[PDB]
Design an enzyme around this catalytic site. Structure first.
Site, short mmCIF file in Angstrom:
data_model
loop_
_atom_site.label_atom_id
_atom_site.label_comp_id
_atom_site.label_asym_id
_atom_site.label_seq_id
_atom_site.Cartn_x
_atom_site.Cartn_y
_atom_site.Cartn_z
N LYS A 155 9.00 0.03 4.83
CA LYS A 155 8.23 1.28 4.73
C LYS A 155 9.21 2.44 4.53
O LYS A 155 10.13 2.58 5.33
CB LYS A 155 7.40 1.45 6.00
CG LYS A 155 6.72 2.81 6.12
CD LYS A 155 5.73 2.81 7.24
CE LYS A 155 4.95 4.10 7.35
NZ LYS A 155 3.95 3.98 8.43
N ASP A 183 -4.51 7.31 15.76
CA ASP A 183 -5.17 6.92 14.49
C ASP A 183 -5.65 5.47 14.58
O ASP A 183 -5.45 4.69 13.65
CB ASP A 183 -4.26 7.21 13.30
CG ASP A 183 -5.02 7.25 11.98
OD1 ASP A 183 -6.29 7.43 12.00
OD2 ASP A 183 -4.35 7.08 10.95
N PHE A 243 0.93 7.70 5.24
CA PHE A 243 1.92 6.95 6.06
C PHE A 243 3.26 6.88 5.32
O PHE A 243 4.31 7.13 5.96
CB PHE A 243 1.45 5.54 6.45
CG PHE A 243 0.78 4.67 5.41
CD1 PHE A 243 -0.59 4.76 5.17
CD2 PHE A 243 1.50 3.70 4.72
CE1 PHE A 243 -1.21 3.95 4.24
CE2 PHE A 243 0.88 2.89 3.79
CZ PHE A 243 -0.48 3.01 3.54
N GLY A 244 3.22 6.57 4.03
CA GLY A 244 4.39 6.36 3.15
C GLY A 244 4.09 5.33 2.07
O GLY A 244 2.94 5.31 1.55
N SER A 245 5.08 4.50 1.75
CA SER A 245 5.01 3.44 0.72
C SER A 245 5.58 2.18 1.33
O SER A 245 6.69 2.26 1.87
CB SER A 245 5.79 3.82 -0.50
OG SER A 245 5.56 5.17 -0.86
N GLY A 278 0.81 -1.24 0.00
CA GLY A 278 0.00 0.00 0.00
C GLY A 278 0.84 1.27 0.00
O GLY A 278 2.11 1.20 0.02
N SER A 279 0.15 2.42 -0.04
CA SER A 279 0.74 3.78 0.12
C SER A 279 -0.34 4.79 0.52
O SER A 279 -1.53 4.53 0.25
CB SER A 279 1.45 4.22 -1.14
OG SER A 279 0.60 5.05 -1.94
N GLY A 280 0.08 5.92 1.10
CA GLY A 280 -0.82 7.04 1.47
C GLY A 280 -0.08 8.14 2.22
O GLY A 280 1.07 8.46 1.84
N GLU A 283 7.84 -6.18 11.21
CA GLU A 283 7.35 -7.58 11.07
C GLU A 283 6.18 -7.58 10.07
O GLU A 283 5.45 -6.56 9.93
CB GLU A 283 7.05 -8.31 12.38
CG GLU A 283 6.64 -7.47 13.58
CD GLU A 283 6.27 -8.27 14.83
OE1 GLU A 283 6.93 -9.29 15.08
OE2 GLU A 283 5.32 -7.87 15.56
N1 O97 Z 1 1.37 1.44 6.67
C1 O97 Z 1 2.09 0.82 7.61
O1 O97 Z 1 2.66 1.37 8.56
C2 O97 Z 1 2.23 -0.65 7.53
C3 O97 Z 1 1.55 -1.52 6.73
C4 O97 Z 1 1.96 -2.89 6.93
C5 O97 Z 1 1.53 -4.08 6.27
C6 O97 Z 1 0.48 -4.11 5.28
C7 O97 Z 1 -0.07 -3.09 4.52
C8 O97 Z 1 -1.27 -3.48 3.91
C9 O97 Z 1 -1.40 -4.84 3.87
C10 O97 Z 1 -2.27 -5.68 2.96
O2 O97 Z 1 -3.01 -5.13 2.14
N2 O97 Z 1 -2.13 -7.02 3.05
C11 O97 Z 1 -2.31 -7.96 1.94
C12 O97 Z 1 -3.05 -9.24 2.19
C13 O97 Z 1 -1.57 -9.26 1.98
S1 O97 Z 1 -0.31 -5.61 4.98
C14 O97 Z 1 2.10 -5.29 6.63
C15 O97 Z 1 3.07 -5.35 7.62
C16 O97 Z 1 3.50 -4.22 8.27
C17 O97 Z 1 2.95 -2.98 7.93
S2 O97 Z 1 3.35 -1.43 8.61
#
Ligand code: O97
Lengths: 273, 8
Positions: A36, A135, A18-20, A14-16, A89
């Site tokens: 991240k 949040d 928060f970052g990428s 994902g991204s937003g 993790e």
């Molecule tokens: N924005 C953040 O700080 C973080 C996001 C994450 C994620 C995931 C982002 C979205 C996910 C997702 O869509 N999962 C699909 C099903 C595999 S997992 C996993 C592990 C640590 C962090 S830390």
């Protein structure tokens, strides 16, 4: 010790704001990680480690990453010319509570009780370590589907916990409490309990109760799904308009609706497997 | 009402 040689970088998750965030493996031992990236230019709040000017996010994560809990742990981080990179993790298999609720609709109370309890324990963990998340919402909660364990993510809008008033807020508006909408002021714990009220409604009703400012400050809670009287009571208490009328963490976890919680393993066997 | 994500 470069980022490129110690971790095998995968594809985007994902991204937003928060970052990428990318999938990654620790080559050292093939551990699943999340990588991240945050641009220095886009960072609002800065802090110092015990010594080094880092993003607040890194400060908060180091404080909560001590031992085991319901918080995604920071395993490593790196500075770069124009960015920082956090190694976190990554449970496999994982789904975020926001997609999980979209897919399944309104959760059974037994499941909502286990999920909500684990979120309460993770937030208490944060508060015990001097960290305010700011949040809490379904999107910032990961479900480890095998272990039945919830994990809190994205401390990018967080702050050191204090007992004095907060006059800044960078979190999700529809989880922000009325006193923030009306007066641009809140205390940490009582704001947190409001957001947890939104989250519990989200879990048992299949979506958040409020979209507009008028609804947030109205504190009229309509249940769009069958919800037990006890659960309606805890939700209305968390969503008291006056901060001082909201329950403490202790009053939530002693609430009658919150008793006889499933263990994480039970939760996976009955509801996730 | 569509359920949707909300930015921070
Ligand atoms: N924005 C953040 O700080 C973080 C996001 C994450 C994620 C995931 C982002 C979205 C996910 C997702 O869509 N999962 C699909 C099903 C595999 S997992 C996993 C592990 C640590 C962090 S830390």
């Amino acid at each position: 010790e470069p980022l490129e040689s110690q971790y095998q970088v995968g594809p985007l998750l994902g991204s937003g704001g928060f970052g990428s965030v990318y999938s990654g493996i620790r080559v050292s031992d093939n551990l699943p990680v999340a990588i991240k990236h945050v641009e220095k230019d886009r960072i609002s709040d800065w802090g110092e480690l015990p010594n080094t000017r880092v993003p607040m996010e890194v400060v908060l994560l180091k404080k909560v990453s001590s031992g085991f809990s319901g918080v995604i742990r920071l395993l490593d981080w790196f500075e770069r010319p124009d960015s920082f990179v956090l190694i976190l993790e990554r449970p496999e298999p994982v789904q975020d509570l926001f997609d999980f609720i979209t897919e399944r609709g309104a959760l059974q109370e037994e499941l909502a009780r286990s999920f909500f309890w684990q979120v309460l324990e993770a937030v208490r963990h944060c508060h015990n370590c001097g960290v305010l998340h700011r949040d809490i919402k379904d999107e910032n909660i990961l479900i480890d589907l095998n272990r039945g364990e919830l994990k809190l993510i994205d401390f990018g809008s967080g702050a050191l916990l204090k007992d004095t008033v907060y006059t800044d807020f960078d979190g999700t508006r529809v989880y922000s409490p009325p006193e923030w909408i009306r007066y641009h002021r809140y205390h940490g714990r009582s704001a947190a309990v409001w957001s947890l009220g939104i989250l519990l409604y989200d879990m048992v009703c299949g979506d958040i109760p409020f979209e507009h400012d008028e609804e947030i400050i109205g504190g009229q809670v309509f249940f769009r799904q069958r919800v037990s009287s006890e659960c309606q009571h805890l939700i209305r208490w968390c969503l008291a308009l006056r901060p001082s009328d909201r329950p403490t963490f202790e009053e939530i976890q002693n609430h009658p609706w919150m008793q006889d919680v499933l263990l994480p393993q039970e939760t996976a066997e009955i509801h996730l497997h | 009402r569509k359920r949707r994500r909300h930015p921070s």
